UniProtKB/Swiss-Prot annotation:
Effect of residue 64 to V: Strongly decreased chloride conductance
Intervals, Cytoplasmic compartment: 1-10, 62-79, 160-195, 251-259, 289-296
Database matches in InterPro entries: Na-dicarboxylate_symporter (IPR001991), Na-dicarboxylate_symporter_CS (IPR018107), Na:dicarbo_symporter_sf (IPR036458)
Official protein name in the record: Glutamate transporter homolog
Segments passing through the bilayer: 11-29, 41-61, 80-102, 121-159, 196-217, 230-250, 297-319, 391-411
Intramembrane sections: 260-288, 337-371
Taxon lineage: Archaea, Methanobacteriati, Methanobacteriota, Thermococci, Thermococcales
Annotated signal peptide: none
Functional note: Sodium-dependent, high-affinity amino acid transporter that mediates aspartate uptake. Has only very low glutamate transport activity. Functions as a symporter that transports one amino acid molecule together with two or three Na(+) ions, resulting in electrogenic transport. Na(+) binding enhances the affinity for aspartate. Mediates Cl(-) flux that is not coupled to amino acid transport; this avoids the accumulation of negative charges due to aspartate and Na(+) symport. In contrast to mammalian homologs, transport does not depend on pH or K(+) ions.
Residues that coordinate or bind Na(+) 1: 305, 309, 400, 404
Entry keywords, A to Z: Amino-acid transport, Cell membrane, Chloride, Membrane, Metal-binding, Sodium, Symport, Transmembrane, Transmembrane helix, Transport
Family statement: Belongs to the dicarboxylate/amino acid:cation symporter (DAACS) (TC 2.A.23) family.
PANTHER family: PROTON/GLUTAMATE-ASPARTATE SYMPORTER (PTHR42865), PROTON_GLUTAMATE-ASPARTATE SYMPORTER (PTHR42865:SF7)
Length: 416
């Protein structure tokens, strides 16, 4: 009966109904002290949605690169790789600079109270750059898939796809027949993954309702106070990054911003609620093929962009750095501000593939400017932003995914 009517209704409109209702209901229950009820019963339905998305990440990445790399010539793949790497560094570098400007205007944490509390552990030492680069080659190809290591998986899939093309050009019929059979089986696996993604988004309206309700009930109350200025500075900066950066580049290269934003609305919104770039990859890759991007292009740029490209995260580090200093009353020299920009860019690619790189990257920036986290006083200031980290996390992820899609279109247009 009514089961069908739920289906024909547009999916995107159903998400907006859940998102608005989740924020409204979350605030009401939090005010009347019913946070435990939301945590016990409402949250598990939200956790089901994120587990479904993370299940498809590994099979869809390996299968897409093998098919994608086979279609594209080896020479063209090199030109695509160098272009996208240059794009990531420039956009991330400018995002940090934009965050510095916003912090100065708002001037957050001028007179916030400081109290001694729990001390953070000694910051994790970043692995040497030579170890990061050498870890791209997987010692065991099957071990990388089982352990969910994205970066080693990309390396093995690209070379496997290239080797298949040479086999299909051989003069031996037996070798040619075997190569086509292997490629067809892998191609079928990729197509099956996309079919599952469509079914998952039908459950998305329920999933988005639970996640927003839980966070607002427990954490939305703490926005009031000096932390409100921090939230205003970050979100205004994030809004500028989407408009002042991405839209300008799209106009320069001839891509229509209005046409692009219509296709990318699905990918942008789902990243806001899940707050996981890796979990959004199945949706993001589905959006890329809809625009008409070539299979070889988006199969390689999007998985790499999720790991290394952090535009919204970079702006978060720049704004948070000023807040800590303002709490202590320290003053940042113009030369020291330039040090932040260089440190943030290097840390983005210097922590590729390490678990929980968010903590390490922020610690490295604080150490560079002369404010080690080991200082007990900065730890109290640090543990103040983490009070509203989850709320800022929701908007931080949206910019990260947007930067990935914008770069893919620019390279695709240049491809011809
Ligand atoms: N949450 C974002 C994401 O999932 O990409 C982003 O990244 C956080 C993160 C999470 C796990 C590992 C590394 C970095 C952030 O700063 O919030
Ligand atoms: Na970037
Ligand atoms: Na990104």
């Amino acid at each position: 009966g009514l089961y069908r009517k739920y289906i024909e209704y547009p999916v995107l409109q159903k998400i907006l109904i859940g998102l608005i209702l989740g924020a409204i209901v979350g605030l009401i229950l939090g005010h009347y002290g019913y946070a435990h009820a939301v945590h016990t019963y409402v949250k598990p339905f939200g956790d089901l949605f994120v587990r479904l998305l993370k299940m498809l990440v590994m099979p869809i990445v390996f299968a897409s690169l093998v098919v994608g790399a086979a279609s594209i010539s080896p020479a063209r793949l090199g030109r695509v790789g160098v272009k996208i790497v240059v794009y990531y560094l420039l956009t991330s570098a400018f995002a940090v600079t934009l965050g510095i400007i916003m912090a100065r205007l708002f001037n957050p944490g001028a007179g916030i109270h400081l109290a001694v509390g729990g001390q953070q552990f000694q910051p994790h030492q970043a692995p040497p750059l030579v170890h990061i680069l050498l870890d791209i080659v997987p010692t065991n190809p099957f071990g990388a898939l089982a352990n969910g290591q994205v970066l080693p998986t990309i390396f093995f899939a690209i070379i496997l796809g290239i080797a298949i093309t040479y086999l299909m050009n051989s003069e031996n019929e037996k070798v040619r027949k075997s190569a086509e059979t292997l490629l067809d089986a892998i191609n079928g696996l990729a197509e099956a993954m996309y079919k599952i993604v469509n079914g998952v988004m039908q459950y998305a309206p329920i999933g988005v309702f639970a996640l927003i309700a839980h966070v607002m009930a427990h954490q939305g109350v703490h926005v009031v106070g000096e932390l409100a200025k921090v939230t205003a500075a970050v979100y205004v900066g994030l809004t500028l990054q989407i408009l002042l950066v991405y839209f300008v580049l799209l106009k320069i290269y001839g891509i229509d911003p209005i046409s692009f934003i219509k296709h990318a609305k699905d990918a942008m919104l789902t990243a806001f609620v899940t707050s996981s770039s890796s979990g959004t990859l199945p949706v993001t890759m589905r959006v890329a093929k809809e625009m008409g991007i070539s299979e070889g292009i988006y199969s390689f740029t999007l998985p790499l962009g999720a790991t290394i490209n952090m535009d919204g995260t970079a702006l978060y580090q720049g704004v948070a750095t000023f807040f800590i200093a303002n709490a202590l009353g320290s003053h940042l020299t113009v030369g020291q501000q330039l040090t932040i920009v260089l440190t943030a860019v290097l840390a983005s690619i210097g922590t590729a593939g390490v678990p929980g790189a968010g903590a390490i990257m922020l610690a490295m920036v604080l150490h560079s400017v002369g404010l080690p986290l080991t200082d007990p006083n900065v730890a109290a200031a640090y543990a103040c932003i983490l009070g509203i980290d989850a709320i800022l996390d929701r908007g931080r992820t949206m910019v990260n995914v947007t930067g990935d899609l914008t770069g893919t279109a620019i390279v695709a247009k240049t491809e011809g």
